[PDB]
């Protein structure tokens, strides 16, 4: 699809932290995500990007596309080690998270798994996409910072 291509082609969103290809997030929430994630990058040198896409036409699921994106945007470990990518497919209510080793170690599998099985699908199913993405960001940031887990919705 044009969406799947554009997301891969355009490269990582350096000034914004979010590629909202599905058009489901507001200007306010994208600004709030920029505030939260540019602060995480400043403090911890981890860059977390979020991508929304309405549906995947290649028969790839969300994790396969997230990994494809990580490898295309950051083609070496020097470039990808500290990077994380969260993908939300809005028609399917499915999310996935991947990233370089330093990012994955910082979050931990428990919170990676919890965010994709709780915040993302539950909130998107109720069409609360801004909350889905912002609550998932806050939860991943809390894990990276060793703060108490805010939990799922
Ligand atoms: Ca889309």
Give a short synopsis of this structure.
Belongs to the UPF0603 family. With 153 residues, the chain is an alpha/beta fold.
How does this structure look, described?
The chain has helices at 2-9, 27-44, 62-73, 77-80, 101-107, 109-125, 129-144, and strands at residues 18-20, 47-53, 83-89, 94-99. The protein has 153 residues and is α/β, with parallel strands linked by helices. The chain has one domain (1-153): Roll (Diaminopimelate Epimerase, Chain A, domain 1). Strands 1-2-3-4 form a 4-stranded mixed beta sheet, sandwiched between helices. Helix 2 (27-44) runs parallel beside helix 7 (129-144) and helix 6 runs antiparallel to helix 7 (129-144). The longest helix is centred in the N-terminal third of the chain and has 18 residues, at 27-44. Bound molecules: calcium ion (CA). Its main location: plastid. It is a single-pass membrane protein. Belongs to the UPF0603 family.
Radius of gyration: 14 Å
Secondary-structure-based class equals alpha/beta
* Spatial strand arrangement across the major sheet: 1-2-3-4
Q: In angstroms, what separates the terminal alpha carbons?
A: 32 Å
Q: How many strands, which pairing sense, and closed or not: the largest β-sheet?
A: 4 strands, mixed
Per DSSP, the total helix count is: 7
CATH topology: Diaminopimelate Epimerase, Chain A, domain 1
What is the molecular shape?
globular
Can you write the helix and strand succession as a string?
A: HEHEHHEEHHH
Draw up the topology in text.
Layout: H1 2-9, E1 18-20, H2 27-44, E2 47-53, H3 62-73, H4 77-80, E3 83-89, E4 94-99, H5 101-107, H6 109-125, H7 129-144
Helix pairs in contact: 2-7, 6-7
């Amino acid at each position: 699809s044009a969406s799947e291509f554009n997301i891969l082609n355009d490269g990582p969103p350096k000034e914004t932290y979010v590629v909202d290809d599905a058009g489901v997030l507001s200007r306010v929430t994208k600004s709030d995500l920029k505030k939260l994630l540019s602060d995480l990058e400043y403090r911890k040198k981890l860059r977390l990007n979020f991508i929304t896409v309405r549906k995947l036409t290649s028969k790839a699921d969300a994790f396969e596309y997230a990994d494809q994106v990580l490898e295309k945007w950051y083609p070496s470990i020097e470039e990808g080690n500290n990077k994380g990518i969260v993908v939300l497919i809005t028609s399917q209510k499915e999310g996935a998270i991947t990233g370089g080793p330093a990012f994955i170690e910082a979050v931990g599998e428990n919170i990676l798994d919890a965010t994709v099985s709780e915040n993302l699908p539950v909130l998107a199913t109720d069409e609360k996409y801004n909350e889905a993405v912002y609550s998932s960001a806050k939860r991943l940031v809390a894990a990276i910072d060793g703060q108490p887990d805010p939990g799922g919705p």
